[PDB]
Write a protein that binds this DNA or RNA. Structure first.
Ligand SMILES: [K+]
Ligand SMILES: [K+]
Ligand SMILES: [Mg+2]
Ligand SMILES: [Mg+2]
Length: 135
RNA sequence: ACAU
DNA sequence: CGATGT
């Protein structure tokens, strides 16, 4: 603790895993939805969590905001730190879209800079992250 | 085991 | 119960 309330919180929602993947980012304090990604027909939970963080980085950079990002995903936080999403999802025609988005997110990380702290939301102490889908 |  | 990840 404590929660850094002046922050952006992100989370993934899915119908199946692998399955339909979406994500959103919210103001940690107010819950206002700041962005939402159109559902992607096939992806994994961790790919969605990764895309959500990267989108948060791009969102905050465009707005000249120094707020941190919270995610509850140990995996996605690491993948962003590494600038490499180490997903097991097969590459085929069905997964081409998510893989294009993941590849492009990695490419963005490799061509841009940011100071945004990426923080682990401590679900066991604080409850569900504010961007949770309730599924 | 831990995080989803 | 299954799957995605470190
Ligand atoms: K949920
Ligand atoms: K497991
Ligand atoms: Mg999550
Ligand atoms: Mg959730």
């Amino acid at each position: 603790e404590e929660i850094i309330w002046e922050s952006l919180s992100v989370d993934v929602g899915s119908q199946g895993n692998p399955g339909i993947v979406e994500y959103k980012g919210v103001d940690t304090k107010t819950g206002e939805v700041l962005f939402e990604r159109e559902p992607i027909p096939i992806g994994t939970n961790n790919m969605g969590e990764f895309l959500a963080i990267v989108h948060g980085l791009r969102y905050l950079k465009e707005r000249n905001s120094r707020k941190p990002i919270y995610s509850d995903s140990q995996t996605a936080i690491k993948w962003v730190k590494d600038k490499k999403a180490k997903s097991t999802l097969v590459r085929n025609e069905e997964t081409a879209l998510i893989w294009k988005l993941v590849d492009e997110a990695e490419e963005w990380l490799n061509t841009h800079t940011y100071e945004t702290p990426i923080l682990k939301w401590q679900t066991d102490k604080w409850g569900e992250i504010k961007a949770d889908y309730g599924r």
